[PDB]
Amino acid sequence: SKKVNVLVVGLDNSGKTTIIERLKPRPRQAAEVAPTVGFTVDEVEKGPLTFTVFDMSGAGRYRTLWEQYYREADAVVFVVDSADKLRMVVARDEMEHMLKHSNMRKVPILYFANKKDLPVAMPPVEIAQALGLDDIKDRPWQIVPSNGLTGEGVDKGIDWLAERLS
Amino acid sequence: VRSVWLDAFNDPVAGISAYTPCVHTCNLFGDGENRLVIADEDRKLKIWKGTQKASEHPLLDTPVAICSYPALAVAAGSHIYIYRNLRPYYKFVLPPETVITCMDVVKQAIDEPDAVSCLVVGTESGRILILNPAGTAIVKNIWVGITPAMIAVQGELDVGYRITVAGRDGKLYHIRNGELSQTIIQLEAQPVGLVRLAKHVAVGCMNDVVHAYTPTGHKSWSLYLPCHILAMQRMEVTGQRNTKALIVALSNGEVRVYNEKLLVSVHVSPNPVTALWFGRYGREDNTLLAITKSGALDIKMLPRTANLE
Ligand SMILES: Nc1nc2c(ncn2[C@@H]2O[C@H](COP(=O)(O)OP(=O)(O)OP(=O)(O)O)[C@@H](O)[C@H]2O)c(=O)[nH]1
Ligand SMILES: [Mg+2]
Ligand SMILES: [Pb+2]
Ligand SMILES: [Pb+2]
Ligand SMILES: [Pb+2]
Ligand SMILES: [Pb+2]
Numbered sequence: 066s067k068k069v070n071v072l073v074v075g076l077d078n079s080g081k082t083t084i085i086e087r088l089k090p091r092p093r094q095a096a097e098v099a100p101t102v103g104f105t106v107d108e109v110e111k112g113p114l115t116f117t118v119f120d121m122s123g124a125g126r127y128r129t130l131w132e133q134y135y136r137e138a139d140a141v142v143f144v145v146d147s148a149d150k151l152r153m154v155v156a157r158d159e160m161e162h163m164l165k166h167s168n169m170r171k172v173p174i175l176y177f178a179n180k181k182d183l184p185v186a187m188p189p190v191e192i193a194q195a196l197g198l199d200d201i202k203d204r205p206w207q208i209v210p211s212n213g214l215t216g217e218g219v220d221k222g223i224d225w226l227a228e229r230l231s
Numbered sequence: 232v233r234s235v236w237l238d239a240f241n242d243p244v245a246g247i248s249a250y251t252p253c254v255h256t257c258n259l260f261g262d263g264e265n266r267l268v269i270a271d272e273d274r275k276l277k278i279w280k281g282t283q284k285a286s287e288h289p290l291l292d293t294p295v296a297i298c299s300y301p302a303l304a305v306a307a308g309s310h311i312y313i314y315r316n317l318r319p320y321y322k323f324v325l326p327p328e329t330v331i332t333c334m335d336v337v338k339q340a341i342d343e344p345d346a347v348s349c350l351v352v353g354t355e356s357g358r359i360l361i362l363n364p365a366g367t368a369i370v371k372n373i374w375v376g377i378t379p380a381m382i383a384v385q386g387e388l389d390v391g392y393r394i395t396v397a398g399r400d401g402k403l404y405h406i407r408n409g410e411l412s413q414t415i416i417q418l419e420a421q422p423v424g425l426v427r428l429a430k431h432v433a434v435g436c437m438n439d440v441v442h443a444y445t446p447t448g449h450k451s452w453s454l455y456l457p458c459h460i461l462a463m464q465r466m467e468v469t470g471q472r473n474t475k476a477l478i479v480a481l482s483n484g485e486v487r488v489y490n491e492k493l494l495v496s497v498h499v500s501p502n503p504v505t506a507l508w509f510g511r512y513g514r515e516d517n518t519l520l521a522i523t524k525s526g527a528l529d530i531k532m533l534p535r536t537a538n539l540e
Contacts, residue, residue, distance in 0.1 A: 150282045151513045
């Protein structure tokens, strides 16, 4: 196989932890998933690629830790709670601080507009406006609305990322 | 210098008509995501969650101020309707024949967020009442001569606690550990707002000057302002940054953030801001909630990496 590092960041309560579970085998999956504490290294295989996945906390306190993994990251999955319009700018700021950081290389970023299933959810196009994804012009990036409960769209995304990773 | 804030979200056509004391945020529904609580001039109690209005409610009287100890507790006339979670629960009333002028909270033990807390009431009669951690019973009654106009509670009820009291007679009284201090300050003009900062209290007198005062009486600094003070509020950032700032909104439309003496941020809201709240709202800890004279709801949030040094 081929081993790659995927950093999964994004604000707290976005469904970072849940989205990764839908990449785990149906029996391996967890019932209730709990607010990630500190961070977690997991593994996922997909085809000829084996993803070494770092699930960080997005809590205020822990946001300081993502920079610890920027240097190594080969791809980043950024997660946004599509119904949480309020903290959108905050997600933008953190996203920017990441891209700016001199350790985060020009690796593929896949943005999950997660929680597509909610009534108040923001549409992928209105989100990429807020985070200003349109301005990112040096990296492969792609936004993909998802439902992490069901795994709806998760495949669509990971597949995209793996295409950039080959 | 410039504005330190992040522009969260704005609703120009909210229907909100409250000044600082009737606005509050807490964890009503315990599910972590805090809600905005407003005792509007509509004699209505509007409730905001996230970025849209959740419920409106009808209110018996037009309300003085609302706090939380969680149970929202509106004060008006002589009643204090303690709703809780969020359905009616009590109608505690002042014993002698009294009207309420201002109300705030004291931490009972922990001096930590979401701790045991006890309601604190000023009455036009001239008493300050501290109540049971339940709210059921009056715990302390300290009588002081002047009419209370606004108050700031700094400390913890068991360890040590001080309350600074803005009298309508343009004077500052102090109460340390239940005992009423003899140090009384002659303010320059009538008090407009009163904030607890780090090592001292800040008054905004009507003549557009914020004064910083030590309980001993010392005048730490003075902020002389280009316009008129409409609202003042404590901005308490915890963490590595650990600063207890002061927010002033002026009728010229600017809102300024002072780190002790030093001006750290200024921005200008389209309309003069009549109510300021800074706290956790939603899932972000450092959020500036602003209610304009035009009834708009403006929400901003302090970046993780902003310095106030
Ligand atoms: N409606 C809906 N709920 C979701 C979705 N994804 C996750 N949730 C739930 O909403 C909450 C989000 O929890 P987490 O997945 O742990 O949030 P996180 O992104 O991992 O961030 P951390 O707090 O740092 O662990 C949990 O209740 C989730 O299981 C979704 O796609 N739709
Ligand atoms: Mg997580
Ligand atoms: Pb697939
Ligand atoms: Pb009011
Ligand atoms: Pb209050
Ligand atoms: Pb003054």
